[PDB]
Design a protein around this ligand. Sequence first.
Ligand SMILES: [Ca+2]
Ligand SMILES: [Ca+2]
Ligand SMILES: [Ca+2]
Lengths: 104, 67, 156
Amino acid sequence: SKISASRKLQLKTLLLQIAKQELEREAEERRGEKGRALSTRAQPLELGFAELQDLARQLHARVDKVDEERYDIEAKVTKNITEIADLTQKIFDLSADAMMQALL
Amino acid sequence: REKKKILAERRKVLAIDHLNEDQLREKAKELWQSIYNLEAEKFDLQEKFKQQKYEINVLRNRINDNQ
Amino acid sequence: MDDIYKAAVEQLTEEQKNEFKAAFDIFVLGAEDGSISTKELGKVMRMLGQNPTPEELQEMIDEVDEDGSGTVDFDEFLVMMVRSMGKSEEELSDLFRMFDKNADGYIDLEELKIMLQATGETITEDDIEELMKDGDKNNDGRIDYDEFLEFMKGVE
Ligand SMILES: [Ca+2]
Ligand SMILES: [Ca+2]
Ligand SMILES: [Ca+2]
Protein backbone atom coordinates (compact mmCIF):
# COMPACT_ATOMS: atom_id res chain seq x y z
CA SER A 1 0.00 0.00 0.00
CA LYS A 2 1.02 3.61 -0.64
CA ILE A 3 0.30 5.06 2.83
CA SER A 4 0.49 3.48 6.27
CA ALA A 5 -2.48 1.67 7.80
CA SER A 6 -2.08 3.97 10.81
CA ARG A 7 -2.61 7.04 8.61
CA LYS A 8 -5.74 5.66 6.92
CA LEU A 9 -7.00 4.85 10.42
CA GLN A 10 -6.30 8.41 11.58
CA LEU A 11 -8.13 9.87 8.57
CA LYS A 12 -11.11 7.53 9.06
CA THR A 13 -11.40 8.53 12.72
CA LEU A 14 -11.25 12.25 11.91
CA LEU A 15 -13.79 11.79 9.11
CA LEU A 16 -16.27 10.34 11.61
CA GLN A 17 -15.72 13.14 14.13
CA ILE A 18 -16.60 15.83 11.60
CA ALA A 19 -19.52 13.86 10.19
CA LYS A 20 -20.76 13.56 13.77
CA GLN A 21 -20.16 17.30 14.10
CA GLU A 22 -22.24 17.94 10.97
CA LEU A 23 -24.95 15.72 12.42
CA GLU A 24 -25.02 17.76 15.67
CA ARG A 25 -25.26 21.13 13.86
CA GLU A 26 -27.99 19.75 11.58
CA ALA A 27 -29.92 18.92 14.78
CA GLU A 28 -29.35 22.45 16.10
CA GLU A 29 -30.56 23.99 12.84
CA ARG A 30 -33.66 21.78 13.12
CA ARG A 31 -34.30 23.03 16.66
CA GLY A 32 -34.05 26.66 15.57
CA GLU A 33 -36.20 25.97 12.51
CA LYS A 34 -38.83 24.29 14.70
CA GLY A 35 -39.05 27.29 17.02
CA ARG A 36 -39.45 29.62 14.05
CA ALA A 37 -42.20 27.43 12.57
CA LEU A 38 -44.02 27.27 15.91
CA SER A 39 -43.83 31.04 16.36
CA THR A 40 -45.56 31.19 12.97
CA ARG A 41 -48.02 28.30 13.31
CA ALA A 42 -48.81 28.86 17.01
CA GLN A 43 -48.54 32.60 17.65
CA PRO A 44 -48.75 33.11 21.45
CA LEU A 45 -52.01 34.41 22.90
CA GLU A 46 -52.77 38.12 23.21
CA LEU A 47 -55.68 38.84 25.52
CA GLY A 48 -64.29 41.31 26.22
CA PHE A 49 -66.40 38.38 27.37
CA ALA A 50 -68.10 37.96 23.98
CA GLU A 51 -64.83 38.28 22.06
CA LEU A 52 -63.19 35.89 24.53
CA GLN A 53 -65.75 33.14 23.91
CA ASP A 54 -65.50 33.66 20.15
CA LEU A 55 -61.75 33.08 20.44
CA ALA A 56 -62.17 29.99 22.63
CA ARG A 57 -64.48 28.40 20.06
CA GLN A 58 -62.07 29.30 17.26
CA LEU A 59 -59.25 27.67 19.23
CA HIS A 60 -61.50 24.67 19.94
CA ALA A 61 -62.16 24.15 16.23
CA ARG A 62 -58.47 24.68 15.43
CA VAL A 63 -57.46 21.87 17.80
CA ASP A 64 -59.62 19.54 15.70
CA LYS A 65 -57.99 20.89 12.50
CA VAL A 66 -54.38 20.39 13.60
CA ASP A 67 -54.91 16.93 15.05
CA GLU A 68 -56.40 15.78 11.75
CA GLU A 69 -53.46 17.20 9.79
CA ARG A 70 -51.00 15.69 12.27
CA TYR A 71 -52.74 12.32 11.89
CA ASP A 72 -52.52 12.56 8.10
CA ILE A 73 -48.74 12.95 8.15
CA GLU A 74 -48.42 10.27 10.85
CA ALA A 75 -50.20 7.83 8.51
CA LYS A 76 -47.66 8.50 5.76
CA VAL A 77 -44.76 8.06 8.20
CA THR A 78 -46.32 4.78 9.37
CA LYS A 79 -46.50 3.28 5.88
CA ASN A 80 -42.90 4.39 5.34
CA ILE A 81 -41.92 2.44 8.47
CA THR A 82 -43.58 -0.69 7.06
CA GLU A 83 -42.05 -0.09 3.61
CA ILE A 84 -38.56 0.37 5.08
CA ALA A 85 -39.13 -2.87 7.03
CA ASP A 86 -40.05 -4.61 3.71
CA LEU A 87 -37.06 -3.18 1.75
CA THR A 88 -34.66 -4.06 4.64
CA GLN A 89 -35.85 -7.72 4.51
CA LYS A 90 -35.24 -7.78 0.70
CA ILE A 91 -31.58 -6.64 1.17
CA PHE A 92 -31.08 -9.38 3.83
CA ASP A 93 -32.23 -12.05 1.31
CA LEU A 94 -29.61 -10.79 -1.22
CA SER A 95 -7.68 -14.13 24.51
CA ALA A 96 -4.17 -12.72 24.97
CA ASP A 97 -3.68 -11.15 28.43
CA ALA A 98 -3.95 -14.48 30.25
CA MET A 99 -1.35 -15.79 27.79
CA MET A 100 1.30 -13.21 28.71
CA GLN A 101 0.86 -13.94 32.42
CA ALA A 102 1.07 -17.72 31.97
CA LEU A 103 4.02 -17.46 29.55
CA LEU A 104 5.93 -14.85 31.59
CA ARG B 1 -78.59 19.92 7.18
CA GLU B 2 -76.03 17.20 7.90
CA LYS B 3 -76.38 15.30 11.18
CA LYS B 4 -72.65 14.55 11.47
CA LYS B 5 -71.81 18.19 10.73
CA ILE B 6 -74.38 19.59 13.18
CA LEU B 7 -73.03 17.32 15.92
CA ALA B 8 -69.46 18.33 15.05
CA GLU B 9 -70.39 21.91 15.72
CA ARG B 10 -72.19 21.11 18.94
CA ARG B 11 -68.92 19.96 20.53
CA LYS B 12 -67.53 23.49 20.90
CA VAL B 13 -70.86 24.99 22.01
CA LEU B 14 -71.06 22.29 24.69
CA ALA B 15 -67.42 22.86 25.67
CA ILE B 16 -67.23 26.67 25.80
CA ASP B 17 -70.59 28.46 25.89
CA HIS B 18 -71.15 27.84 29.62
CA LEU B 19 -67.94 29.20 31.22
CA ASN B 20 -67.68 32.63 32.94
CA GLU B 21 -65.08 35.37 32.16
CA ASP B 22 -62.23 33.69 33.92
CA GLN B 23 -62.58 30.01 33.17
CA LEU B 24 -62.83 31.25 29.57
CA ARG B 25 -59.40 32.90 29.58
CA GLU B 26 -58.05 29.86 31.45
CA LYS B 27 -59.61 27.40 29.01
CA ALA B 28 -58.28 29.39 26.04
CA LYS B 29 -54.72 29.11 27.37
CA GLU B 30 -54.99 25.31 27.56
CA LEU B 31 -56.51 25.12 24.07
CA TRP B 32 -53.60 27.13 22.64
CA GLN B 33 -51.04 24.98 24.47
CA SER B 34 -52.75 21.98 22.89
CA ILE B 35 -52.49 23.62 19.45
CA TYR B 36 -48.82 24.43 20.05
CA ASN B 37 -48.17 20.85 21.20
CA LEU B 38 -49.89 19.39 18.13
CA GLU B 39 -47.95 21.66 15.77
CA ALA B 40 -44.67 20.66 17.44
CA GLU B 41 -45.59 17.01 16.91
CA LYS B 42 -46.62 17.82 13.33
CA PHE B 43 -43.29 19.53 12.60
CA ASP B 44 -41.34 16.54 13.94
CA LEU B 45 -43.44 14.14 11.85
CA GLN B 46 -42.67 16.23 8.76
CA GLU B 47 -38.93 16.10 9.46
CA LYS B 48 -39.16 12.33 9.99
CA PHE B 49 -41.02 11.98 6.68
CA LYS B 50 -38.21 13.63 4.71
CA GLN B 51 -35.59 11.39 6.33
CA GLN B 52 -37.57 8.25 5.48
CA LYS B 53 -37.70 9.32 1.83
CA TYR B 54 -33.90 9.46 1.81
CA GLU B 55 -33.63 6.15 3.68
CA ILE B 56 -36.00 4.43 1.25
CA ASN B 57 -33.99 5.90 -1.63
CA VAL B 58 -30.78 4.39 -0.25
CA LEU B 59 -32.54 1.05 0.29
CA ARG B 60 -33.66 1.02 -3.35
CA ASN B 61 -30.07 1.57 -4.53
CA ARG B 62 -28.86 -1.31 -2.35
CA ILE B 63 -31.46 -3.80 -3.61
CA ASN B 64 -30.78 -2.95 -7.25
CA ASP B 65 -26.99 -3.02 -6.87
CA ASN B 66 -27.01 -6.36 -5.00
CA GLN B 67 -29.29 -8.19 -7.46
CA MET C 1 -11.23 -4.96 9.57
CA ASP C 2 -7.72 -6.24 8.87
CA ASP C 3 -5.91 -2.91 8.46
CA ILE C 4 -7.31 -1.67 11.77
CA TYR C 5 -5.19 -4.38 13.41
CA LYS C 6 -2.08 -3.59 11.38
CA ALA C 7 -2.51 0.01 12.52
CA ALA C 8 -2.54 -1.27 16.11
CA VAL C 9 0.61 -3.29 15.38
CA GLU C 10 2.30 -0.21 13.92
CA GLN C 11 1.56 1.63 17.20
CA LEU C 12 2.97 -0.95 19.62
CA THR C 13 5.73 0.53 21.73
CA GLU C 14 9.10 -1.18 21.63
CA GLU C 15 8.25 -2.40 25.16
CA GLN C 16 5.20 -4.39 24.13
CA LYS C 17 7.16 -5.69 21.14
CA ASN C 18 10.09 -6.68 23.36
CA GLU C 19 7.71 -8.39 25.79
CA PHE C 20 5.73 -10.05 22.99
CA LYS C 21 8.96 -11.35 21.45
CA ALA C 22 9.98 -12.96 24.74
CA ALA C 23 6.56 -14.59 25.01
CA PHE C 24 6.73 -15.68 21.36
CA ASP C 25 10.18 -17.25 21.73
CA ILE C 26 8.91 -19.29 24.69
CA PHE C 27 5.81 -20.18 22.65
CA VAL C 28 7.94 -21.72 19.88
CA LEU C 29 10.20 -23.89 22.07
CA GLY C 30 10.19 -27.35 20.50
CA ALA C 31 8.64 -26.41 17.15
CA GLU C 32 10.98 -27.44 14.35
CA ASP C 33 10.05 -24.54 12.05
CA GLY C 34 10.40 -22.10 14.96
CA SER C 35 6.76 -21.07 14.57
CA ILE C 36 3.45 -21.64 16.36
CA SER C 37 1.79 -24.75 14.94
CA THR C 38 -1.47 -26.19 16.24
CA LYS C 39 0.63 -28.35 18.58
CA GLU C 40 2.17 -25.48 20.56
CA LEU C 41 -0.95 -23.29 20.37
CA GLY C 42 -3.04 -26.19 21.67
CA LYS C 43 -0.67 -26.75 24.59
CA VAL C 44 -0.92 -23.10 25.64
CA MET C 45 -4.73 -23.26 25.45
CA ARG C 46 -4.94 -26.67 27.08
CA MET C 47 -2.82 -24.99 29.78
CA LEU C 48 -4.84 -21.72 29.70
CA GLY C 49 -7.97 -23.52 30.94
CA GLN C 50 -9.59 -24.28 27.57
CA ASN C 51 -9.73 -27.32 25.28
CA PRO C 52 -9.70 -26.88 21.49
CA THR C 53 -10.31 -29.36 18.70
CA PRO C 54 -7.39 -29.85 16.27
CA GLU C 55 -9.44 -27.92 13.68
CA GLU C 56 -11.04 -25.43 16.05
CA LEU C 57 -7.36 -24.51 16.52
CA GLN C 58 -6.35 -24.43 12.85
CA GLU C 59 -9.09 -21.80 12.47
CA MET C 60 -7.34 -19.40 14.87
CA ILE C 61 -4.00 -19.91 13.12
CA ASP C 62 -5.59 -19.45 9.69
CA GLU C 63 -7.23 -16.20 10.85
CA VAL C 64 -3.85 -14.43 11.09
CA ASP C 65 -1.88 -16.67 8.69
CA GLU C 66 -0.75 -14.41 5.85
CA ASP C 67 1.63 -17.10 4.68
CA GLY C 68 -0.54 -20.11 3.89
CA SER C 69 1.75 -22.14 6.16
CA GLY C 70 -0.64 -23.18 8.94
CA THR C 71 1.83 -21.60 11.37
CA VAL C 72 2.02 -18.25 13.17
CA ASP C 73 5.32 -16.39 12.99
CA PHE C 74 6.22 -13.35 15.07
CA ASP C 75 4.67 -10.75 12.76
CA GLU C 76 1.44 -12.74 12.55
CA PHE C 77 1.75 -13.23 16.33
CA LEU C 78 1.67 -9.45 16.85
CA VAL C 79 -1.50 -9.22 14.77
CA MET C 80 -2.94 -12.01 16.92
CA MET C 81 -1.97 -10.15 20.10
CA VAL C 82 -3.61 -6.84 19.15
CA ARG C 83 -6.70 -8.61 17.77
CA SER C 84 -7.28 -9.69 21.40
CA MET C 85 -6.86 -6.22 22.88
CA GLY C 86 -16.67 -0.58 16.49
CA LYS C 87 -19.64 1.69 15.81
CA SER C 88 -23.25 0.57 15.49
CA GLU C 89 -24.84 0.21 12.06
CA GLU C 90 -27.68 2.59 12.96
CA GLU C 91 -25.10 5.23 13.91
CA LEU C 92 -23.05 4.69 10.74
CA SER C 93 -26.24 5.07 8.69
CA ASP C 94 -26.78 8.61 9.99
CA LEU C 95 -23.12 9.51 9.44
CA PHE C 96 -23.34 8.08 5.91
CA ARG C 97 -25.97 10.73 5.14
CA MET C 98 -23.52 13.50 6.03
CA PHE C 99 -21.14 12.27 3.32
CA ASP C 100 -23.85 11.94 0.64
CA LYS C 101 -24.19 15.67 0.06
CA ASN C 102 -26.22 15.40 -3.16
CA ALA C 103 -28.40 12.72 -1.47
CA ASP C 104 -28.11 10.26 -4.37
CA GLY C 105 -27.44 7.28 -2.08
CA TYR C 106 -23.71 7.05 -2.86
CA ILE C 107 -20.47 8.73 -1.84
CA ASP C 108 -18.33 9.74 -4.82
CA LEU C 109 -14.72 10.90 -4.87
CA GLU C 110 -15.49 14.63 -4.65
CA GLU C 111 -17.78 14.17 -1.64
CA LEU C 112 -15.03 12.12 0.01
CA LYS C 113 -12.53 14.90 -0.74
CA ILE C 114 -14.83 17.58 0.69
CA MET C 115 -15.06 15.64 3.96
CA LEU C 116 -11.30 15.02 4.01
CA GLN C 117 -10.63 18.72 3.42
CA ALA C 118 -12.99 19.45 6.32
CA THR C 119 -10.90 17.32 8.72
CA GLY C 120 -8.26 20.06 8.91
CA GLU C 121 -5.36 17.65 8.35
CA THR C 122 -3.17 18.06 5.29
CA ILE C 123 -4.47 15.74 2.56
CA THR C 124 -2.42 14.27 -0.28
CA GLU C 125 -3.38 12.63 -3.55
CA ASP C 126 -2.18 9.31 -2.13
CA ASP C 127 -4.31 9.72 1.01
CA ILE C 128 -7.35 10.23 -1.20
CA GLU C 129 -6.23 7.68 -3.73
CA GLU C 130 -5.94 4.89 -1.17
CA LEU C 131 -8.94 5.91 0.95
CA MET C 132 -11.28 5.63 -2.05
CA LYS C 133 -9.19 2.57 -2.99
CA ASP C 134 -10.13 0.90 0.31
CA GLY C 135 -13.80 1.90 0.21
CA ASP C 136 -14.71 1.18 -3.40
CA LYS C 137 -14.17 -2.60 -3.72
CA ASN C 138 -15.99 -2.91 -7.02
CA ASN C 139 -14.16 0.15 -8.45
CA ASP C 140 -17.32 1.76 -9.83
CA GLY C 141 -16.51 5.29 -8.68
CA ARG C 142 -18.96 5.11 -5.77
CA ILE C 143 -18.97 3.73 -2.25
CA ASP C 144 -22.51 2.58 -1.55
CA TYR C 145 -24.06 2.11 1.89
CA ASP C 146 -22.84 -1.47 2.29
CA GLU C 147 -19.27 -0.56 1.30
CA PHE C 148 -19.38 2.35 3.76
CA LEU C 149 -20.24 -0.04 6.60
CA GLU C 150 -17.27 -2.30 5.85
CA PHE C 151 -15.10 0.76 5.15
CA MET C 152 -15.75 2.01 8.70
CA LYS C 153 -15.83 -1.33 10.55
CA GLY C 154 -14.09 -0.85 13.88
CA VAL C 155 -13.37 2.84 13.34
CA GLU C 156 -13.70 4.47 16.76
CA1 LIG D 1 2.42 -17.90 8.80
CA1 LIG E 1 -23.44 11.53 -3.34
CA1 LIG F 1 -18.61 0.78 -5.07
